[PDB]
Amino acid sequence: SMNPPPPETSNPNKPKRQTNQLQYLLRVVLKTLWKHQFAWPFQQPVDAVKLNLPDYYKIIKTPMDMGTIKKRLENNYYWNAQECIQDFNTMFTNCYIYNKPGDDIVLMAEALEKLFLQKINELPTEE
């Protein structure tokens, strides 16, 4: 029922890059999802205490949220685009794993995921 430590956004010994694909993931993908009307439940780690979801972190063992992704992108945490794309997919998948079909939160994740898929479809080639 307690909250775990959040996912790390800083790791000095992890090698990093700033690639055109990662720039796209921040400037286009993250920005688009972040401003969406349904972004709010996904802009920070799930607070299982405040939301009274005591089993959340029993079921979700790889938590991820856009607040974490935003920090990772802004602080150059990633080596490649695949790592970041995986984080987005983890976030959506967690929502579908934990909740029921037809739940508001699932409809919200689906709307964000649709836009995500449209933006990743036009991920630029590596310069």
Which distant-in-sequence residues (6+ apart) come within 8 Å of 116 by Cβ?
29, 33, 88, 92
Give the residue with the Cβ less far from ligand 6XW, 30 or 46: 46
CA distance 63 to 91: 7
With binding defined as CB under 6 A, does residue 103 bind ligand 6XW? yes
> Quick check: 28 binds ligand 6XW (CB under 6 A)?
no
CB atoms within 10 A of CB 52: 9
Q: Tell me which residue has its CB nearest to ligand 6XW.
A: 41
Rounded Cα–Cα distance for residues 71 and 50 (Å): 23
Residue labelled with tokens 């037809």: 102
Site string for ligand 6XW, 34-63 (x = CB under 6 A): -------x----x----x-x----------
Tokens of 77: 């945490």
| Residue 74 Cβ vs ligand 6XW, minimum distance, rounded to whole Å | 21
Residue among 49 and 51 whose Cβ is closer to ligand 6XW: 51
Which residues sit at the interface with ligand 6XW, rule CB under 6 A?
41, 46, 51, 53, 95, 98-100, 103, 105
